[PDB]
Each structure stands twice: as C-alpha cells, then as structure tokens.
Subunit: 149 residues, 2 copies
C-alpha cells in the first residue's frame, strides 16, 4: 500500500546473509533507519549504504539496508567493503518488504530508492521516496529524525 508518517510500520519477512528469515520483531525495542536501494552493486546505492551506516549512532538504534539483491550479493558486498557492522537484508524471494512499504519498481522487479525512520515502537517518524532526477536521499533529514528519537 502506501506508508504514512505516524502510522505503525507493517511487518515484513526478508532474508539475512545467512539465509535466515528476519522480521521487524527481530529488532524489537530499537529505533530503525531503513535504507532501501535498487542494488548495492551500483555506485550511488553503495554510497547511500556506507553513509547511513557511518553517520547513524549504532549504539543507540539499528540501520537496515533492504534490496532485491540476492543474499549472496549482499554478503559479498559487506566482505568486499571490509565492514562486519553493516546489516543487509534481501527482499528477493517475495518482495514482502517492498509490497508492504509501497517501493516496488514493478517493471524492474527492484526496490525504489527510499528511506523510512521508525521509532522504538515502530512508529513511522520519517519517509522519503527518492524523486526522479534527485542525486541522493536527504541524509541529514533522515539522520536528524533518527537522532531525535
């Protein structure tokens, strides 16, 4: 459907890099910054992933990266980047996350670039679906929503 700020976040089922099922409850009690990309194997999406992960206080909450990349791509990316502190989750099987959050590019079977921030109660306190022609998501706005919780 469409996610509106103020609404409770819908649950989803995605896969970790070890092929385990992950749902929103696996991060119970934490704030979340959910960064959605078309592919981690593209340059702009790489840069988005790295910047949210470096800039967001991970002592205070969780940064999720969600894409239609296979789990095997996402695991290889983390190894290649030399980062073991970066959570990547794969919506490839079902587009559970993408359908529930309204970010599927249907003609591509890829997820649209987007950002959600959820408070510790899964209240949606920020949303950006990145527009046509826009260089990057608004890092600062999302990061401020996250830090304010």
């Amino acid at each position: 459907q469409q996610i509106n700020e103020g609404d409770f976040a819908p649950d989803f089922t995605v896969l970790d890099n070890d092929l385990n099922q992950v749902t929103l409850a696996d991060y119970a009690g934490k704030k979340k910054l959910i960064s959605v990309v078309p592919s981690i194997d593209t340059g702009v999406c790489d840069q988005q992933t790295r910047k949210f992960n470096s800039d967001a206080s991970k002592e205070e909450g969780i940064v999720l990266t969600i894409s239609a990349d296979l789990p095997f791509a996402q695991k290889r990316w983390c190894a290649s980047a030399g980062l073991d502190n970066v959570i990547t989750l794969s919506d490839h099987r079902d587009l559970s996350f993408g359908e529930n959050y309204g970010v599927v590019m249907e003609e591509l079977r890829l997820l649209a670039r987007a950002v959600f921030v959820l408070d510790a109660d899964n209240k949606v306190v920020y949303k950006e679906i990145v527009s046509e022609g826009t260089d990057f998501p608004d890092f600062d706005a999302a990061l401020a929503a996250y830090k304010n919780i």
Copy 2:
C-alpha cells in the same frame, strides 16, 4: 515442467549485464552449453562457471551462464574476475528461462544447478539437473556431449 533429451529448446527472455533483453534467437546458428546456477556469488557456482567456460571451445559454440542473480551482481562478477569472454544472463525479473526449462527451486526463488547442451538447431542433446546434495554436475559428460556436436 520438464525438458528431456531429444526435445526442442524453449524460448526465454533474460537480461544481459547492461539490462538489455536477450532471447534464444540472439544465439541463432550456434551450438550452446547452458550452465544454470543458484548464484554466481557462491563458491561452487563460481567454479562451475569458470570450468565450463575454460574447458569448452568457444571457437566451437556459445557457453551461457544463467541465474536469478541481479544483472548488477553478474556485471560486477565478470568485472572483478577480469573475465570479458564469459556470458552471464539474469533470469531475476520473470523466471522466464527457469520456468520454461523446469529448473526453478520454487521455495527459494532460485535456479537449480543444471546443464543443457543444445545443437545448432536447438535440439536438447544432453541434460543434467544436479541432484540435491551431490557435489558438482558431471562436467565431463556435458563437455563431451558439447564437443561431439
């Protein structure tokens, strides 16, 4: 559903590493070794890809690697491998190839490890769908079938 030796090769629509559509007709007039993999970003599948590519004469026919990997992962694999003579194709979008050739692992939305050898008029002259828990395909038998055409 099930392609058997002596049947004709179905059509398919897949993507090349630059997101161009590719179909059976784009390889008209040539014999084909089609190597199917769950993901090029796994070790066993990396080795399968490299072995068929190295051991099959490409003065002889075409060696195709098909998986559900995104095009971006396949592009990155070729680039990082320094392999500019390996054809990788992505069935991610629609599973056109995997459904037509009967090789989807439907509970995972990945392609089963499998090998089809096609003569120049697209008769299937050799097939293996690799059994669950067997180490590798029979490289020698498929390569023999290919070389014999």
